[PDB]
Structures are given as C-alpha cells and as structure tokens.
C-alpha cells in the first residue's frame, strides 16, 4: 500500500507607484520703467572705472 | 576646509545699503562692495530608501 500528497502554492506579487508634481506659483509681477533709472551705486561705480 | 578671513565683508563704504531679507525678515546693511546678497531660498531633497 502507497499513498502520496503533495500540496505547492506559489505567489508573486509586484507593485510601483510614480508621482510627478509641477507646480509653479506665481504670485508678482513687475515691469521696470523705459528711462531714468537709478542704476546700483556699485554698478555706477565700476562703469566709471572702466 | 575653509579657511581664515581674507575680504574685509562689512565695510560699508559710508554707505546706508539696507536690504530687507524676506527669508528672515529683517534689515541688513550690506557692505558697498558686494555685487549682490540675495536671500531666495532653494530647498533641495533627495530621499533614496531600499
């Protein structure tokens, strides 16, 4: 007399996740004036040294 | 390594240089050489878990 059992079970699991965000906020504004403007004391400076 | 002070960075030149930092939010005098000191924050994260 034989007797046989066998029994297997086998499980894969595979799992990914992306996220990309791109926000961009703008929250000013500005436009500097055409003429006259008041240039950097320093910037002044090394024009007038050249 | 960094080493010792070598630019005298807070000679003001007789200059009034204030800049308001947003970041701290507080008036700083900037020195009358500087060309720019900015306060524009860059937060900069890399997480790499395995």
Known sequence: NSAFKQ???????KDS???RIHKVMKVL???TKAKDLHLSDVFLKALNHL | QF????????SFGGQCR??????GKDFYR?????????????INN?????
Do not use: C, P
């Open chain 1, 7 to 13: 029994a297997i079970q086998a499980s894969h699991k």
């Open chain 2, 30 to 42: 900037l020195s009358g050489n500087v060309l720019s000191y900015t306060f524009q924050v860059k």
């Open chain 2, 18 to 23: 204030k800049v308001f930092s947003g970041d």
């Open chain 1, 29 to 31: 504004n500005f436009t």
């Open chain 2, 3 to 10: 080493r010792n002070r070598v630019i005298n960075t807070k």
């Open chain 2, 46 to 50: 890399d997480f790499n878990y395995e």
């Open chain 1, 17 to 19: 996740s992306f996220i």
